[PDB]
Symmetry: D2
Subunit: 246 residues, 4 copies
């Protein structure tokens, strides 16, 4: 992973959780990381301090990338600030609350797919020419990595149906992007967390516990590094303590 | 399949292609079929004539079910006309044209996902209480069947990314619906066509040719019938001449 | 399914359970069925009486098809008796008892793999030329259908590892056979039961109960019939009450 | 991966190809590696010299682990020599030549499953108590990693049917082992190479070329390291240039 030194990595929803853990872990290899927050309260100085104290650098960016404009805003700021992108990590998403099918309306359906689908489509669309440029300059590969989900495979919980589907949406659009963009030397891969932090849900996990964010980050590092994963595209790595074994 | 006589079957996008072929075949068992057309020119008298000549009955409905209103209209009409519903077949959808990722805008994205995601979510949502009632009265199961795609599994063609992803979305949301609604004795299953109606796309199909709509219809009949598929839910049957073997 | 009248259908492990239920249901369409028993006690006259009373015909054969010789015997008898073969149903198999990994020896390993792998490989191998001939004369397709398992996908129960793996083996070898033999107009498809006939294993099934053999039979009929499934090959239909949703 | 220093890693079929590349890559982190050869000619001094010059250590062992005895022999020698196992890498296997189904006999079927199935079952069986011991001592996890195949998923090429199936056999037995042995803190994961080193087969690979062995090794390192993959079990990582995107 020494190839990560100086690599410019924009990570959505990275102000907390899996995104922040990944940011820090990438920072240990000397990456330059664009941290980003939607609405969750946050402390940019603290967060960028951990990156720097870890051996890296970066900046903080704010955007409600449920909207397309917000998504081109984010990508723009990153690019002004660091003059390009080597790795895009689509990590922003989440439940947007739970509804049974019969209480789902347009608002809800749209909130979920904006947060999970549109965001990723547009975040990735705008990056592409910069991702292309950087692979062309390095003569290696640049990378996209998105956060998928166990729920992509087995339907998710009751009330999370549209969220679950949006992750399947993501798992499959990556496959499409492998066809369009492999000739641009851009890779696409997914990390699919299971349960990450009830005692019933644990029973269903062979390892008997929820994951920590620290346990999720290395898979992203792996997919981020051309040295490690240069012949790997179109894949999903499920990180779940055995909870599902596809 | 004698259990199909008199069953009330709403089929979206059934004015032609797969959906019409299915309608006819169900009509051979004496089903009562709601036929539906969105944009395409059609001849209701001709189409309903085939159903009746096949041994069934039905009616024809018009709706641009890319909109939720349109979707609640359709269901309502069907239910007025036949006083309920034993089977819903979500067959409406399609490419909505092709775009490379970089030319995808909010319009295109939303045109694909409305035709493929929203339609099916809302069509299915409004049906549920009636599906529930019908299973409650029969003491067996009612059914949902949707048209999936080979593209749901392997990414689709170049420019078809959003459409392909929307089919994965559907394949996975069904798994959610099994969790919410199996308690209501409603089943959910998919038929996933491959190539249906170039001469290099044939090379990829072990059977060496595209499918015909007649070859797709029986799989729907199968999923429609409690006698045949009463212990089957949460499944996909791929009908593709060997093109993909999951 | 009227296309099944007179079709000659060899079904392994058909003296009871799923295979016998299938035999009867095929017999309802006027199939001619070769029934087969390995070890279990059985009553040929009773069993063949059911086929005939259902509207079909058949004969009964005895073979311990864990051995290749036994497998060539069975096929030969069937072919003498009915002068050929339109459908082979590989249904013989099963646990052969349970062992934790550490107690597995060459005997146990070989008893499981002979019952589940070798049987199916050789049963199917010896059938091929006749299956080929029958498709050649009909100008349609002949068929192989094998009994898979939920355990093929998710590992099986503790002590059942080798059995579970042998079903994955079968699921995948079918995909190979599609490549070799689609040119011969032979189709290959699987039915994968879940739990079929504790009260916590029910909790894992959305439909809340085990399947019955009657509920498994129709899926075989479906795959047996060129009229129904002529463009379908390389597939698995899982029949499990929602227990797994691939 | 600094956690790999001093870790004792027995790698079957490691005298050449993927196994040797992995051995060397693990040696860069200071692992102690048991190299092993079946029958392929080899140069132990040269091979162990690369490990040592890479920063590691190890030994060389010879065994025709197509036989169970040979498999307990191998495990024994490793264990005498290094006093236990932290990671078992089941990499031995391969085509054993090609046969069409109709020319497959017992010899062939058995040669293939001995090489690909029995070897792995027994290699792993004998390691378990030592794998268990070492996780218990470290209070982390010990690991098994096997070499799977793209052919496990899509049937393999004509003539390689039994080989392809044996890899599916392996992919699924791992799932079983996750159920039996997670409570022993032993992980199980797979690396599934695609094509690794005709110009037709390249056309089917998005990256347009075969993999090199150097490109396969990092995935094994990743699965070998508790630090990197401690919450990861029951998984397959496909390393194939996009050739299949499960």
């Amino acid at each position: 992973f020494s190839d990560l030194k100086g690599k410019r990595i924009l990570i959505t929803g990275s102000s907390q959780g899996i995104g922040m853990a990944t940011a820090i872990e990438l920072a240990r290899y000397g990456a330059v990381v664009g941290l980003h927050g939607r609405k969750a309260p946050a402390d940019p100085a603290l967060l960028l301090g951990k990156l720097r104290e870890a051996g890296g650098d970066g900046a903080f960016f704010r955007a409600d990338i449920t909207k397309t404009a917000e998504c081109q805003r984010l990508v723009s700021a990153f690019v002004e600030r660091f003059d390009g992108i080597d790795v895009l990590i689509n990590n922003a998403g989440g439940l947007a609350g739970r509804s049974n099918l019969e209480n789902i309306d347009d608002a809800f359906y749209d909130r979920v797919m904006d947060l999970n689908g549109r965001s990723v489509l547009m975040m990735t669309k705008f990056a592409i020419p910069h991702l292309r440029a950087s692979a062309k300059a390095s003569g290696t590969t640049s990378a996209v990595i998105s956060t998928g989900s166990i729920a992509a495979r087995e339907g998710g919980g009751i009330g999370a149906g549209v969220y679950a589907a949006s992750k399947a949406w993501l798992h499959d659009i990556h496959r499409n992007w492998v066809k369009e963009f492999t000739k641009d030397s851009i890779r696409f891969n997914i990390v699919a967390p299971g349960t990450v932090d009830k005692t019933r849900i644990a029973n269903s996990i062979p390892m008997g516990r929820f994951g920590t964010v620290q346990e999720l980050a290395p898979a992203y590092v792996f997919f981020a590094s051309h040295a490690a994963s240069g012949y790997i595209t179109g894949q999903i790595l499920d990180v779940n303590g055995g909870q599902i074994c596809p």
